[model samples]
Target: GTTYYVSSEHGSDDNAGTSQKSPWKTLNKVNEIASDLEPGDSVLLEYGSEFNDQWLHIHDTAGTPDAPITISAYGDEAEGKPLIASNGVEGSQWYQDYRANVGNHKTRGTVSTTLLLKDVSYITVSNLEITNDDESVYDPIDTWQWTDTADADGTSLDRSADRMDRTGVAGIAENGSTMSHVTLDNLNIHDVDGNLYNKHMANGGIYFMAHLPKERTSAADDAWLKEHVSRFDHITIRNSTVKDVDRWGIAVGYTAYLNYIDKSSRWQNDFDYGDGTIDDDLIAKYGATNVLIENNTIIGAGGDAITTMYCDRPVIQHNVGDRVSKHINSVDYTANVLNNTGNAGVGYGRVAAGIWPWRCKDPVFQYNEVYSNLNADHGNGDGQAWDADYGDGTLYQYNYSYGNSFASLMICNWKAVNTTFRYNISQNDKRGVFDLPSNGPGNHIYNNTVYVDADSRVLTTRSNSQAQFENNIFINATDEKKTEEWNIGGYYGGQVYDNNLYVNYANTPASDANAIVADDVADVLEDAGSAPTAAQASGAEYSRKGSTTVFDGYKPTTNSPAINAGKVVSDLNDYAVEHDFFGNTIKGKPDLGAVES
Candidate 1:
């Protein structure tokens, strides 16, 4: 089957590209005929055309989920879509999968893509408009450099702190290849300069990598080997649009197969395969499966905005994260190394967030929307809007968060376990909105709707994590009445706060005793209110233009007092919580926040 075309203006790789007027120009002629397609082939790519400096190293293309090989886009939808602008592309064409002997300096595993799907599969990438601008003489606000694959094969290194990671669509399933049915739709991926101290999602905008091969030696390869590793299957990035790129915006990485038997833990944090045990038959033989990142829209991210690592039952939905970790006030980057310049993205200290899930297993984050993740340099710690970092049974449901700076959900590592945040909504976030760590053990924070603003901090723990804060709804919209401190003074490492409903809070709770105290604010909600969508408002622009409105005002005020108030917890009654955050139906006395009557 055939239907090829590509036009840098009426093409000509000696024409015969089969139609749309005999087109067949660049993208290196559909990657030199993508190995003679033919599996329902269709390589279009013409819609106002503009392939500047060319790129698309698609290799070994294969298809068959009932015939599929589509590398989309074609013809005027009013002159837009097609445009793959990159500044250059030399240096052994990069992608060496470096390993500067592991640890520190963002793992230097080189990457430089503009569409490089190596072990291709049932492809279907849509409406394009990617950009990679590596002609930097410096000053990506103070320092950052690259001239195509930056030092691809020639290096006195230090081109700008020994950096090399950039992408606008990348994928690679090394050696034992398993890249599968990928489908990214309506892509726009913008201005990617990369190297912000690399927290690697291949540096930015849509990435998928699973590499393994530093020469393994097996007793049957130590464990789980579908004949040597490499994976990613049934991946999907929908309704996409990643803006102003930098340090991770749409990510995924997996080397989990006992890290090929611990070569110093492939891809950091020793993903389970070394005594953290989630080995369900070694993840059905090399994890990463049926992943789906839906309805995406990420703006200005110099760090975390949509992440997923070693997925298994992943499902990140209805996404929108604004003004992401903006390199936490741009560059301290461990005091900017190598180039002796101002360093790249401050990873170690400069953390980011707006949809997280690393070392995943039973993950499921839903109806997402994060707001201006207000920036703060190096140690302002991880600016947040959701994180259940490090694997096993994570489940954050129906969400919406606003104005972030430091916290609003993080049930962090120590090989996390059974994490859960149900029916969510937070407004005016900052400093603290539960950033509990020391995880593992049926953790749960229920029925949410927290709106704090008195300089925030309603929860924080570090001593011995195993949480439980049932039935919530804490407000304090601040008309300033003073007194608001609870960064866990007296640390409740044995955490548990029941039937919550604090309104003008003053650090309530010494020991349950049926918590619930109010002062005001809870009139009602609906009529599309809750603000923060015009590109996250505050100085809009570079945070990328707005449309705002997606806060159908967290409703709930029929006879307020939080409707039927809540507390059904029968050890979570079989965990998938009957619904409500908009799906309604959660009766049996369930309601404190997150809408439901």
Candidate 2:
């Protein structure tokens, strides 16, 4: 193991690159020895220095689990981290190699990305600033004309949107290979104006892809799948900030469907897998596993922010996002196609906002703050802060959402099986609180606090199935019109609505079993204090100071009817909820909604 240094201030490629005094002047010296990076080697870039018109490509490198390769910044913190800027010379270069299937049989060209780590493992890239803000002709050297716009048909919008891939930093494991134990920490990634036209061709802030053959039925495709199906394992990105990025902020794994045989139904759902129930093998082969994204601040993303697609057991927590889905607003959904040309506007908006996990298994999203998800012209764009989409056994708890355009939480699409929403808080949000679809996962909604405004609806159900609402507080704020509206209004049939305390609803025997609708919000909450209130129930603050999770606030007082008002559902009392939102132990019967008062 050895240490290498790169400094624009006092460096030259002629030196040994072993110390600060003899640091390499340019990134070209590092690229020259790309294949020779050994285990436990450290490449340190000087602080307060900038690498202009250069990219770092590390390929076919292996490091031991105990001794991973490191690329970081060193020097005075006052000077700031090393800045790698793309001044037209950096980013995807081109070569005439792979042929394109689109435009006749012409010769096609591939790309050389900005920071390419191909087939490398046990690597850490931290404390650096990566930016590609060049405004010139941002086209790769390509003879193939890529699909610049998406078709009006939904099929192209979903699976085939981004066909040409561009990125800021990328990690790839090609056929028959794997990349594992990679950590991207404390990075400041901004101004990455990459390919926005086609999402099918991977373009984003940080992209990790594992490539497989077209179909496993063919001999070559099956062989490739056996070798490189698990492209990424144990990848973690934490304590970073990614903002002002075009395309996606951070996209992991490509989107794919699993078709299974289901004797219960003849029709096919969105998963496209023939309905025979999904198993471990199907989930593993189609997705990355053990990916963690936490404590990152993402602002103004053009498309989706922090997505885990086709992965297993992905854990996303404690992140903050504002003004996401900007790209979704830029598209022309009314037109037959969605693009940013003369036919429409120029900006960023997304189909959805906040943190989403798609087609994964047993994913956990908690303690995150997602706000200001604006409305996109796309009908689905109500800007939900958390979406449990197309997965099984999802757990969303102890999260905070405010000023969302749509519902604070959405459980929709792709057969969400046995999902749970608990110990969360939503306040002053428009449109509604929860949007539950009919065909997806059976949901267990419990122990949540939802305070809606004048334009807010408590619940919206689209003929969904298998939902149980128990022991939650649904109330309208002071600005709401005092009317006999149904706080829980929806067309869902397979629903068990009981043991809930509501405010300003019809309350007309929706159930005699144990649903209470109060006329005053004070009856439900202890005080309903104004902003800057304390965490005590009497003070009535929905949030607590210096608490990322639901560590305090929104708990019921002794006089409150919510205390011990919950029905004991055996299945909901699991290890995840053994303790209340404030980390207090819940011994006997639990209190209703989010806290243990």
Candidate 3:
């Protein structure tokens, strides 16, 4: 219940550290007393204090919900935030104790975490600036890559010539323990130079691992997974900035939790072991709960900006992602998503998306803006603003996207069901506006306003994609003459189109019964606003160099054909009642776009 202070610039290790005037100097003393910290305890690092290559490893620090342990900053108004320049010390130590087996991911003597949090509950870490620059170049050829080899028991074993995964901060559950009510806020994390090909753990700004310490190859350990529960509850990260980080900006844990899944009965057809549909019982029982990631800005990430896996009813909203998927790997020479060649080069292919969820139930991604993500099908795919990838009941609403190299939204890949992408706006997004590849049956895409440039593939579908287009408006600006470019053909599986309006392009659906063909977009959109400038991006240094109508321009005019010309549908689940993207109420037959006038 006391307050402790640490000042690396001016303090001694022998000091009592009870006050700011006399504080402890080294991080060693803080680690020694971390386990002894009780509820209502506070640790304050003085602003402008620089801890070079030193770290804070707070383990087993406990607190109550009303009185969480605080690790925050204190100082004069003139100084900046406290700096934890780990400078790749933890990564080097993890490399020293490297293990290729799956069991060693949890028991390694040291891992790459500038601020390591293990088995801590009811904790708050805020207002710190962290950086971990290795001061080295990755091996452009093969040293940073991974080569996967299967073990005797059909479990995946990694043979990686990889550096340890690095991060600004990390929270880990050790030996099948649970950590809950942890919050990270207002932190500025940058310059984490990690391995580009590493795909498993802790390869970016922030990671939370409700981990598995035993190998799945071992039968005893597989039995252990049934006996123990290792997961995070009530995890929150908000108001943070993650920039110049490789691989991932912020990713919540799911690797070990997938082992508990048995998706044989949940899949619509034949399914894979761990990557297919899941039952409601297993999702509610084993998944992380109360996960919230909001109001953060991620820029210049080499991989996906933000993601959460194996979560239940998670809400990810109000975030900005720009210039993500920027890693042009020296091996493949591009920022591709995956290398399925299955030859010698395994982990060399790089791919990324702005915000997505995997193996989670009923995740909500709303009120977000993602722009300028790179690479449209250079090596593989991905560069979309939003992807409802491999989940259930996923919803994407009230979002804005522009200038991404690939599609605007991707409803993708294996047992992804009930994905309702409504009340959204997109401008200049390329490849496929709905990049559908190998998905489940229940995809409801409606009530969106989409604008594509010249030669944009409006909807690129492949392999078991079953989607319906309803109550939407699509505008195609044309200088080139490609008739099939905007058509709703060239797709596999069930594709239905109705109650939709198309402008300035040919190639409607083969038999769209209620398609409205128009000549101009200004007649429908009413107020075509200007494109957002660089100043509109939230603190991102780079921007998309083109223009489209602003967010307000997606609404329909009172005299427009998009007004009250939509079909009434009953796809909405038992959620809340009617409000459009711009706060207008839905009366009977709705409007065609995100806004209801």
Candidate 4:
């Protein structure tokens, strides 16, 4: 039950293996011999040996952490130079091993990257390299899609191989397995290219879907939608490197149960495509639960690094990305938590943003640092939005955001109630926070920092919902003075603003110089391009050293009159650690605005 050596000359039992002198010739012979392996055994591929499309299917083989099922490369790292290829050196077909290659074509494609299990437990696969060198010229019209044809008997299109590329390089796709404690670590899988027509087929180094059954439809039934159905349960992929997959890094389908006890003999033939007897379309897809995706570098996919649609209770944390369209995009799920903020952004009209949550409920965006998400139109593309008709019980707190287009936080339209935005900084947004046009409740925005200039930005709202805006910093850094006015009683939704500082408005050149003046009374206010009076604050408190009205450095001066004039807020506590223009902490009723000195 020790190491089993695999080489070119060994078969079932060459003197090189089972006993140190004899070994296995082919991988098939190794499988035949190892079929009776109990647990705590390994099948190692010897060094400098090449395999042409080796087929391996291991299930019902269990192992423990102390002696888990280990199939690894043999000898020292230098002696383990084993190379497995689906095609020969000249890119010729290696079709003799059907199970070795999972691609549609017999040659120049890939085999399945998986070990199917059912009601099985304790499995592991490590330190191996899998490649799908789809170099052969296949028929473009033969992979996962619709086509045009006329023959009633369906014979005109009866060609065997249409050059279908590789689907998932590997998978744990088995029919409803109670598989627990499975680990796949330290793998490098890449170079997965799609075929000609089906631009979005190949996906996931590991795929988890429902193990579906096919409906016995007449020849008139749709062929593409009927067969090839499978689902999965209790799977995990950690500490591995998977890039350039078809769509997602990890995919999870719904759940459906299959009973083989009644029709065991009739279901024997299901292993060719999948294992089961349920309709492909009728199989229910189970979302992920208690799923954790962490500490992986997922790069270069057309979709998000991690996407959960209609799933529940998933923990997505600490994953880095370079240009994944939407790093973590979660939709229509509940109690789903997003822990770390990825560097999600866009470039030169790409139209992608970081930390975007659409149609999600009871979600939290906490303690993340999001930088340079200014890609689509304005820096606004850099922040979060709960755009109309969705999102509730959502909380965004204790985070730092900068260089975005609009206010760091954007809550627009008929948003769900109980949404909170606190202890955050909105610096340099051309358009300031939320433009509420309708009604919703328990929505609170307080204790935050906002930096803007009179001629550059404006924070306005149009709703009648109850809102609390207090203990915030609103900075105006412009030679061309502008005013920050409250949306009078005009805001049918009343907003309470107090305990904040408004400096630098009158510190410029003249009297009546304060640009941000409160309304004579609590009223909804609007403007028709009317230029207001300049500020009248004491000149010792504000300073300006910038060029244009927009996109310039507007720093706060020492002994600035604006400091220590605000009240304690519910959030905005972390800002005390972030220094201001004068390099001082903005704590203990610090001056109002994005900078605290």
Top candidate (lDDT): 3
Q: What are the per-residue Cα lDDT tens digits for candidate 1 across 1-597?
A: 888888887788888888987888887867677766767888888988998877777777687888888887878778888988764366215654522122243444456778877778888878888877665522332133223333332322222445567888877777566878888888888767677656643678877867565434544454544475678888899887887677678887545343532224444433333433365455545667888988788887667888887677789987788767655443334445322223433244466778888776777888787875756323446677888876767788878777787777876756666677888887777766777666665678888887777667566533246577777877767775435543343223557778877776666666556776766655533422265543433222122113333544566667767677787765441465777766767878887767775
Model 3 deviation from the true structure expressed as Cα RMSD, one decimal place? 7.1
Give the per-residue lDDT of model 2 (tens digit) for 231-282.
Answer: 6788898888777665677777653222221111221222243321346676
Who is ahead in lDDT, 3 or 4?
A: 3
TM-score of each: 0.36, 0.82, 0.85, 0.47
Clashing pairs in 3: 336-350, 336-351, 337-351
Q: In candidate 3, what are the lDDT values of residues 215-284, reduced to their tens digit? A: 4544445566656667778999999998877668888865455555533232222335353456777766
Q: By summed lDDT, which 10 consecutive residues of candidate 2 come out lowest?
A: 98-107
Positional deviation of residue 514's Cα in model 3 after best superposition, in angstroms: 1.9
At residue 466, candidate 4 shows an lDDT of 44
Best by TM-score: 3
lDDT for model 3, on a 0 to 1 scale?
0.70
| Model 2 bad stretches (over 4 Å) | 87-91, 94-112, 136-165, 213-224, 227-230, 255-271, 274-277, 330-350, 377-382, 461-466, 479-492, 526-553, 572-576
> Which of 1 and 4 is ahead in TM-score?
4
Model 4 segments beyond 4 Å from truth?
A: 1-120, 133-174, 195-202, 212-235, 253-286, 309-311, 326-597
lDDT, candidate 2, residue 56?
Answer: 85
Candidates ranked, most accurate by TM-score first: 3, 2, 4, 1
Model 2 lDDT, residue 265, Cα: 28
